[PDB]
Design a protein around this ligand. Structure first.
Ligand SMILES: *Cc1c(COP(=O)(O)O)cnc(C)c1O
Ligand SMILES: *Cc1c(COP(=O)(O)O)cnc(C)c1O
Lengths: 397, 397
C-alpha cells in the first residue's frame, strides 16, 4: 500500500536504534529550570543542543506579554487574516520586524519553513530561475519544489561556481539567488559580500535566510548580511521566530515597493490560520528587546568563543577553524564513536545535537553545540570538562 | 523583476478597493469581549465570520493551561522534535488525538495546511495517484504540487465521476483518495459513505479532512465520516487545531500499523520547530474537553438551524436546502450587491465572511456565516434582524 515505500526507512531506523542506547530522535525534556537546564532521563542536564540563542524563552517580559495576550485575546485566532480578520497584534509584529530590520515591508507566516516555502514558490514562476547552494536548507528546496521555476544548484560555498552558473543562464528571465548567512551543519559563514556582488552582476534578486544570526550578527543584529556591509543590497531577508525570538513563526522582510502584493499571491500565507495571540505577543516583545540586547549578545559570543577555543585546545576536530557563529560542531571518526560520545555526554549531564548520515554527508559524524546567551561561564567550563571526560573515555582525544 | 508578475493582482486589488468602503481583506478586531463579540471600526460587533465553532478560545480551563505552560515551560521550543528534542506535551497532545479519534496513530504538525501538504506529498510517490475533488481546499492541491504523484481530479461532489475516474487508472499502483467532510464554501456535506465505498472498490486508501466538523459531527464528534458510519474504514483523518480546538496546529490520525514511519519521511514534520508550550497545552486541554462538550455541541447546532431556517424564511437564497453544517452561506446576485450587503451588516454591528470571485466560482457571491457554540439565541435573533434590515435596504429581499 502507500506505506510500503517506507519499509526501508523503518528497517534502517530499527537497525540504528538497536546499535545505540538512547534514541536521539526521541529526546524529551521532562521538567525545565531555564533556557540552559532541564531534566532528561531523570538527570539534571545542561542543554546545548537547542536553538535558543538569545535565551528569550524565559524572559520575564516575554512571558508576561504571552500571559496577558491569553487573558485578553484568548487561545486562538479567527482564521486566515485575509479572509476572517485578525487581531491588531499581527500588524504590530510586522511593524516590529520593519523596525528591527529597518525595512518598509514585513510579512509574517505561521512558520519559518512556510515563509521559505511560500516566498520562493511565489516569487519565482515558470521560466524563471531559483539559484541556490547545493547544501541549502530543506525548506528552501521545498519552496523550489512547490514552485514552477527552474532550479540551479551551485557547488557548496563556491563564489566561483555561483558566478559561472548564473552567467550561463538566459539573460532575460528574472532570477532569485537564495543564500543562507550561516551554514548550520558546521557553523561556518557564507561569503555573502562576494556572492551578492556576483548575483547583482548577473541582475539577480537576492534572498538571504538569517535564521541562525538574529540578534547577534551586524550592528543591529540583523544578520550575517548586515555584518558584511550589505545593508540596502539584499532584496528579501527570511527568518524564523523559533531560534532567537523564542516562539513559532516565520517572516520575510524587504524594501521592494511591491512587496505587499506577495500577500495576494502567496498560498501558504493565505490558506492558514493566523498565529495565536500569545505567540504574536511573545514574538513582538522579544523582537523589540532583541534590538538592544547587547548584554545577551555579549554573553552568547563569549560563551561560543570559550567553547570553540576550549574544545580546539583539547584536540577535538571542529567544523570551523575560528568561532564564526553560535554553532560549534565537533567532528567524529565514525557512526559508533559519535553515538558513544553523544551517549557519554548525555549520561554525564549534557545534551548536544548528534548529526549523522544521511542527515550529514556520508563520512561526516557530528556533535553540534548551539550556545545560549544565558549559559554562564561556569556552565561552559563544566561542558568543556564533560567533553574532555567523554572524549578520553571513548577515545576521541 | 520577480514582482512584475503581480502587477495584474495589484491593479485588480486596487480596483476592488476603489469600488467598496471597508477592505474585507484587512478586518481587524481591536478589542475582544468573547468568542462572539469584538470592537471593529469602533463598533461593538457580533462575530459571525470566524471559525471558532466550539467557542473554546476563552474557555477558562484552556486559558489556564496556556498560562501555566508559559510559566513552567516558557514561550518556545528547542527546535525540531526529531533533531533538538521536545517537551512531553507533544506526546501528550498526540495521545489526546488518539483518544479523541480512537486511533493507534497521531502525528501533530505546526499547521493544518502543513499537515495536508506533508501527508499528501509523503504518502503518494512517483507513479502513484492522488484522487481529489475538483474544488478541494488549497492545502490539498498544494500537497499534490509538493509531491511527485499523478493528480486525478473528479467532478465536484460526483460519486459517479469518482468511480469512473478511479476505475480508469492502472490497477497496480497505490492510490490516495482525498475527501473533505464539509464543503466549506456553501456549507454542504460530502457523500462520504458512497465515495468511500467507491474508493475501496478500487483498492484506494482514503484520507478525509475533518477540519470543519471537529467536536460536532458523529457520536464522538470525530467528523462527517463518523456521522456517516465509516468508523474503521478511513485510513487517515487530517485536521486542524484552528477551528474547533482554538489554537494553531494540524494533525493526521490513523490506525495504519506503519503510521509512525511518516515521521521519518515527512519533510514538513521534520524541518520545522515544534509548537510552543502554551499552544500545545491549550490544544490538549481543549481536545479533552471536546470529547464530552455536549452542551456546546447542542448550542452550536441549535444556533445553526435557527440562523439557516430564519434566513430561508426571510427569502434569502442559501447555499444549502437544509442546515447541514455550522456554515450558512447566503448567495447574492452580483459583486456590488454582496459588498453593499456585507458593508451594511458591518456598519450595523455584524461581521460575516464575504466570498467573491476568484475565491468563489465566477457568478457566485456569498456571505458566509460560521456559527459559534457560544452564540446565544438572542444573538441569533439579533443577527436575523440585522440581515432582514440590510437585505431590505440593499434590495436582496
Ligand atoms: C530554522 C530554519 C527553518 C525553519 O524555521 P521554523 O520556523 O522552525 O519552521 C527554515 N529554513 C532555515 C534556513 C532555517 O534555518
Ligand atoms: C482550515 C483548513 C486548512 C488549514 O488549517 P490551518 O490549521 O489553518 O493551516 C487546510 N485544509 C482544510 C480542508 C481546512 O479546512
Amino acid at each position: 500500500d502507500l506505506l510500503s515505500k517506507f519499509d526501508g526507512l523503518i528497517a534502517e531506523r530499527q537497525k540504528l536504534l538497536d546499535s545505540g542506547v538512547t534514541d536521539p530522535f526521541a529526546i524529551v525534556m521532562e521538567q525545565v529550570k531555564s533556557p540552559t537546564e532541564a531534566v532528561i532521563r531523570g538527570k539534571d542536564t545542561i542543554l546545548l543542543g537547542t536553538y535558543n540563542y538569545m535565551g528569550m524563552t524565559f524572559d520575564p517580559d516575554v512571558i508576561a506579554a504571552g500571559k496577558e495576550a491569553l487573558e485578553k485575546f484568548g487561545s486562538g485566532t479567527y482564521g486566515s487574516r485575509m479572509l476572517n480578520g485578525t487581531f491588531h497584534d499581527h500588524m504590530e509584529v510586522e511593524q516590529a520586524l520593519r523596525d528591527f530590520y529597518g525595512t518598509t515591508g514585513a510579512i509574517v507566516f505561521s512558520t519559518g519553513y512556510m515563509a521559505n516555502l511560500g516566498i520562493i514558490s511565489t516569487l519565482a514562476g515558470k521560466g524563471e530561475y531559483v539559484i541556490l547552494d547545493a547544501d541549502s536548507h530543506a525548506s528552501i528546496y521545498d519552496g523550489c519544489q512547490q514552485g514552477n521555476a527552474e532550479i540551479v544548484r551551485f557547488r557548496h560555498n563556491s563564489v566561483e561556481d555561483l558566478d559561472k552558473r548564473l552567467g550561463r543562464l538566459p539573460k532575460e528571465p528574472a532570477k532569485l539567488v537564495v543564500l543562507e548567512g550561516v551554514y548550520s551543519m558546521l557553523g561556518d559563514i557564507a561569503p555573502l559580500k562576494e556572492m551578492v556582488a556576483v548575483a547583482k552582476k548577473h541582475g539577480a534578486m537576492v534572498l538571504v535566510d538569517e535564521a541562525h544570526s538574529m540578534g547577534f550578527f551586524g550592528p543591529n543584529g540583523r544578520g550575517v548580511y548586515e555584518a558584511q556591509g550589505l545593508e540596502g543590497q539584499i532584496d528579501f531577508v527570511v527568518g524564523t521566530f523559533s531560534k532567537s525570538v523564542g516562539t513559532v513563526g516565520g517572516f520575510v522582510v524587504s524594501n521592494h515597493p511591491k512587496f505587499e502584493a506577495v500577500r495576494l499571491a502567496c498560498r501558504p500565507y493565505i490558506f492558514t490560520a493566523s498565529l495565536p495571540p500569545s505567540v504574536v505577543a511573545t514574538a513582538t516583545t522579544s523582537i523589540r528587546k532583541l534590538m538592544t540586547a547587547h548584554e545577551k549578545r555579549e554573553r552568547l559570543w563569549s560563551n561560543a568563543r570559550a567553547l570553540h577555543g576550549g574544545l580546539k585546545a583539547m584536540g577535538f576536530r571542529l567544523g570551523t577553524e575560528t568561532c564564526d557563529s553560535a554553532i560549534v560542531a565537533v567532528m567524529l571518526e565514525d557512526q559508533e564513536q559519535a553515538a558513544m560520545m553523544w551517549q557519554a555526554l548525555l549520561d554525564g549531564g549534557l545534551y548536544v545535537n548528534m548529526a549523522r548520515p544521511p542527515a550529514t554527508p556520508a563520512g561526516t559524524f557530528l556533535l553540534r553545540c548551539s550556545i545560549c546567551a544565558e549559559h554562564t561561564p561556569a556552565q561552559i567550563q563544566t561542558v568543556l570538562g564533560m567533553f574532555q571526560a567523554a572524549g578520553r573515555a571513548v577515545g576521541v582525544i
